[PDB]
Amino acid sequence: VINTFDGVADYLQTYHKLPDNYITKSEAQALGWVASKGNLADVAPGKSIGGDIFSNREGKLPGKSGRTWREADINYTSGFRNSDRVLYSSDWLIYKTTDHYQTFTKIR
Template identity: 50%
Template structure:
């Protein structure tokens, strides 16, 4: 009889833990947000121990959204293969010609101000932008947008939607 009670207790605890896990993962217990995060297509908060963080090394070149975001998160700067528009133009870049890789050592554009004019992101932050997945030629639509306090967003479609990759200090 005592074993039967122990088994019921253990099953009850396991069932409760499973229910809490399901409710948390499904968002059932999520608090409602001020409509600001409704603009975001998804939100992922990463910690410094995540795999993509451990895959980046200071001083190396990166272009994938996750690796560039991890680099920004860890080192608070863009990887070495990024230059601003002004630096690119000084090197001979003519945007209409898509000649960035021809006049630089395969650099990408990043570090310039992002206006957030549509207020798609929280208005209290100032932002910068960086091209990601750039493979030469004309700039594509993919961007990272990041704030000084550590928020990092990915836009696959030139600012039509955003996915929050990292949450900075509030």
């Protein structure tokens, strides 16, 4: 699947959407994903959680009018979700977090 920081960042800046292996939290849930059981891979084989809007409430990511943030899980294969995410904007800035949105660093 395309689920690496680089693979995903380069694909988003090109096609302007996530690769086909991503599903939002709502799509996941509908299929039977129960976060507490870490069963995403059992119920949505080869899929990763991605595409949800990220509020950025804690203002850690650069804001701008008309700008929206989205997140996508990175490096996921099976089990419980990891701590790695890509944060991308409506204007295509790309950031990464490997610590559950505590800290961010620009990648694109």
